[PDB]
Design a protein around this ligand. Structure first.
Ligand code: NA
Ligand code: NA
Lengths: 289, 287
């Protein structure tokens, strides 16, 4: 008792934790005018039953691919022994999905959040027959937003007009670059960069964090923010890469996807990027697409 | 590039469950202001991404006093023999609940930490709040799923069924009943089947977050909606020990306004058994 003592339609592909995280983050900020969650699991699982029960006003859950029609953004969150076999399994899942989703939303931006992101973005590009500017992966977007917060807020470091980005291939080995001027000591900038990078590298990347970074990218696209994000983008022509690979590059994002790749200062950065391009390209060559 | 081919709500804990509650509450616009208390080692930067994301009405803090004047305080924090594990959880609550109760003296305390029955009792003891304003998530998620299973998965004619008692793999159900007479055997068969469908399902952080947000909705908007929540069960089912079990309650601005009357033998048997075992564990805890 009382005793004491335009209508912005967005499709999230996948009803797993990442798909749910994207859905909730997008809904939390009111980014979508309407949101379709494509639940592609076995029906018996009832993977998204709780979301149906919760009944978000502008959210529709469906198992029908055609429910995604006329989307502004289609977000891929789905995922499947040896490395090549595991990647091939993911590729094969995308092969049965991307062409249909591309058909249903022919003017959308395709946003790839499935891993390994560089290969999966390339695969999505090849399967959709979309222009490269409208196919992007989450790349090092989360890394970059965190790194910038680390420098500004954790380290309270004086950075003057210069912005820092994590670029290239997503992984434990991380590559950074600066875009901006006030003259700064090379030694001090390297020391700052190394320190902020160490702080970043120990952090995990859980589904909720990825969902939040995805929602922010969708925000930029649907509202034509022209905000810079480091995303997986077609890297041929940059850093003397002559192969068709997607690496994370700082891009201006808006209604038509990537509007511009911004220039950064120019060497180990090129070397690491070319090495990534080489290994990614070699793995793409042995995949069945 | 071109080429082709004022309702203030505090969430206690910044772990996955705390985040899930925060996002679910924000998604529906339930909170006017939301404070997320990040009680981890600040070195981990547990909630950094949520700060970066910058939800308009969300404040992240490590300061307990930032929770002051909340309408609802949600406990999502958690954490070797079973008694030692629960004791560590109790000890964490001992350093927390009394301060949060002090800072929001007129709030409803909503306990989402496990084992929920014991942790709700502990929160009740530590806060010195009236029992109606201390509730646990109990079997709320179970109940909402079970009703959805019957109505939507089984398309069965009947919403008036609740999962009650102690949260666990072996579940107890009860019906409110009405003027329409139904065959006992048919109702038992329906219940067993829906219960099996429910029992194979997991309860992930995102699912619990959604069910929590819905309960917060009922409280802060005074919905007077029935939820099966962990509530002081003394007086019900011949239990005269102070234990919290999940009972169907009407929730509103002052927490539990009424425990609804539900069904006639095995249900009481299972409830008394749960009451006894829970009470035994409470007696051996240091509170
Ligand atoms: Na809906
Ligand atoms: Na904020």
């Amino acid at each position: 008792g009382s005793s004491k003592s335009t209508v912005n339609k967005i499709t999230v592909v996948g009803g797993g934790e990442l798909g749910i995280a994207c859905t909730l983050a997008i809904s939390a900020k009111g980014i979508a005018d309407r949101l379709v969650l494509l639940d592609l699991s076995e029906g018996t699982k009832g993977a998204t039953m709780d979301l149906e029960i919760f009944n978000l006003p502008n959210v529709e859950i469906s198992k029908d691919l055609s429910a995604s029609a006329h989307s502004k953004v289609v977000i891929f969150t789905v995922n499947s022994q040896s490395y090549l076999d595991v990647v091939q399994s993911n590729v094969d899942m995308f092969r049965a999905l991307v062409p249909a989703l591309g058909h249903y939303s022919q003017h959308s931006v395709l946003l790839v959040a499935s891993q390994p992101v560089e290969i999966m973005t390339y695969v999505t590009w090849k399967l959709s027959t979309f222009p490269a500017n409208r196919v992007i992966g989450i790349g090092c977007n989360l890394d970059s937003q965190r790194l910038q917060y680390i420098i500004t807020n954790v380290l309270k470091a004086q950075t003057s007009g210069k912005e820092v980005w994590v670029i290239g291939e997503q992984g434990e080995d991380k590559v950074l670059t600066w875009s901006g001027e006030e003259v700064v000591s090379h030694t001090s900038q390297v020391q700052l960069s190394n320190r902020a990078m160490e702080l970043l590298r120990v952090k995990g990347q859980r589904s909720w964090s990825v969902g939040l970074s995805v929602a922010d990218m969708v925000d930029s696209i649907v509202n034509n923010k022209k905000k810079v994000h480091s995303v997986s983008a077609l890297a041929k022509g940059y850093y003397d890469i002559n192969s068709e690979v997607f690496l994370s590059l700082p891009c201006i994002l808006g209604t038509n996807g990537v509007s511009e790749v911004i220039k950064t200062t120019l060497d180990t950065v090129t070397e690491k990027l070319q090495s990534s391009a080489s290994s990614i390209h070699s793995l793409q060559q042995q995949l069945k697409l």
